[PDB]
């Protein structure tokens, strides 16, 4: 019953007797599978996680300069060099500077000058790789097993709960039989590669917000980068795209940093597919998982139960789902449980032919003593109609209209 209230639902109607039902699972969407003498099953794809992603590249968007200097030589007096030129963590520019008798050099001509400064990337971003071997889906299913109340949409426990199971699926071994001991087993042979796509993309993380980028876009970025995953003060390649030299005079080429580049990339990411991490792994949002579950060993619980006799009570006001169906919570007061709930819909009301079909097929009461509560979902016919809960005297009728 984990799908009551879903915006993007799919009323997938199965085949009477047949074990073949084709279901497509979109993220944020669920599928209610109703069939012949078998319980109706809610099916939802909750998570599309990825496995270890290796850090392929890492660019820089906020640098910090330090320890700069400028050595200058006189014209025709040698090539100017510094004490820390060959250090890789230092960016340097060797240009010419006009000299003369005013600066100190005894010749009138252009001279040498070299300016160096230590590079240290403050804020950097990382780009990772994704493989089809890495992704791992996660499907949760919950049967309309005549569950009490509405707050039966909580994953607390569940391990000790039937009619509701979790299955994990991998492209390598996507078999993943779903066990629900009260109602039997439920096979599900699912096929990946419907998720479009994973051909050649990257998982880009900058500060804490992640996206999925292309190959040559992420390759073509004018920012410092290094291809290693080392945290040991590694050498940054292409340090010139963030460090600028302007207007040297005689002994100091004014160095200027090009500032931060976070929002600069954010303007270049308007339209890219977003992403979300999961602590260590990463989540996806495309989904569209085509699947085909076989319901052979599914068994309907509650057929031997004999139609309840005492009176029900409306526990909460029935409401109309956005699709048209109506949810009802009723409350039985009697030790005659377990027993099948006598709920139906009729327009004549006397007596007593049914019009609409149920959604929670063959609704029961789990507990026996003493005053239990249970949930219901019906598909009323179009137009005005009555809903009837209970049998004989003390039964409850209610007016209803659809669309």
């Amino acid at each position: 019953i984990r799908c009551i209230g879903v915006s993007n639902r799919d009323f997938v109607e199965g085949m009477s007797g047949g074990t073949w039902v084709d279901v497509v699972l979109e993220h944020g969407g669920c599928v209610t599978v109703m069939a012949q003498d078998k319980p109706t099953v809610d099916i939802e794809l909750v998570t599309t996680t990825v496995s270890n992603m290796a850090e392929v590249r890492s660019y820089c968007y906020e640098a910090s300069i330090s320890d700069m200097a400028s050595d200058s030589r006189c014209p025709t007096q040698g090539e100017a060099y510094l004490d820390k030129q060959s250090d890789t963590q230092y960016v340097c520019k060797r240009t010419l500077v006009d000299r003369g008798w005013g600066n100190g050099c005894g010749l009138f001509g252009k001279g040498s000058l070299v300016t160096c400064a230590k590079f240290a990337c403050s804020k950097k971003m990382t780009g990772k790789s994704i493989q089809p071997e890495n992704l791992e889906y996660r499907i949760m299913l919950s049967v309309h097993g005549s569950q009490h109340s509405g707050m039966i949409v909580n994953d607390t426990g569940h391990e000790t709960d039937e009619n509701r199971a979790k299955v994990e699926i991998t492209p390598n071994s996507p078999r993943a039989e779903a066990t629900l001991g009260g109602f039997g087993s439920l096979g599900l042979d699912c096929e990946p590669r419907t998720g479009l796509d994973f051909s050649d993309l990257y998982y880009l993380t900058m500060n804490n917000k992640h996206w999925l980028v292309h190959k040559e876009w992420f390759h073509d970025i004018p920012l410092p980068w290094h291809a290693g995953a080392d945290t040991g003060t590694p050498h940054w390649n292409n340090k010139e795209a963030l460090v600028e030299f302007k207007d040297a005079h005689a002994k100091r080429q004014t160095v200027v940093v090009l500032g931060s580049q976070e929002g600069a990339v954010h303007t270049a990411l308007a339209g890219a597919l977003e992403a979300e991490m999961d602590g260590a792994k990463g989540r996806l949002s495309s989904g569209h998982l085509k699947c085909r579950l076989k319901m052979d060993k599914l068994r309907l619980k509650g057929v031997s139960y004999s139609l309840c006799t005492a009176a029900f009570t409306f526990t909460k006001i029935p409401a109309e789902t956005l699709h048209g169906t109506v949810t009802v919570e009723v409350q039985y007061a009697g030790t005659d449980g377990p027993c099948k709930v006598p709920a139906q819909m009729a327009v004549d009301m006397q007596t007593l032919t049914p019009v609409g079909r149920l959604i929670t097929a063959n609704p029961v009461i789990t507990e026996s003593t003493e005053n239990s509560k249970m949930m219901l979902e019906l598909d009323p016919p179009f137009g005005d109609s009555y809903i009837v809960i209970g049998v004989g005297e003390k039964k409850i009728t209610h007016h209803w209209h659809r669309s």
Partner: antibody
Amino acid sequence: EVQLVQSGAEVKRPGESLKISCKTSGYSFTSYWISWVRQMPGKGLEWMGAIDPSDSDTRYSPSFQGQVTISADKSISTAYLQWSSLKASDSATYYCAKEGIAARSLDVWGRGVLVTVSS
Amino acid sequence: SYELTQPPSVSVSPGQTARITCSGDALPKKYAYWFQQKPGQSPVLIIYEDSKRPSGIPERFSGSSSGTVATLTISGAQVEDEADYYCYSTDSSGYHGLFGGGTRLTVLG
């Protein structure tokens, strides 16, 4: 906004080990260099050494290289200046200074720590 | 060894121009930084890059480095400027520090 809180006054004896500290708060500690300056009583300023906390890169003056040890724990944003064998001639006021963008460009000064060493 | 040479004492009458000289060899190729230190207080930056004045410093403190000599100019000296004055620079390599001997100023008002 920048705050370079130095250690408290220290009185030691000749031979004892000592480590003075310069705790920083208010700027990017792993970006700017950290320099130390010694000033003996009645004497002038003497630059001892500098250190980059990004990789603990150290530059020592030839008059002090081999007699002091400069370290820094960038995790807590604090510089250090320690002596293994304290001489009697080491009694002075010590300043920690956050450098600027240029090499050895002194930008922010501390309040100075008083080091007294007598037998 | 390498030291910067400063005149030990310099005197100036109130309202006149006090001049302080810092002698160096690599100063034609490196910059200088003028600091002022009062008794008990820590040093303050007076001049950086040999010609620029920071904020919070009065407009009278000027400076200029010419060839092998740096010069600190104090136009309109006052009795509150009586303190110690140091220069500072880098060695020929530019990665080590160099402090001058000092110039204790004296105002006779």
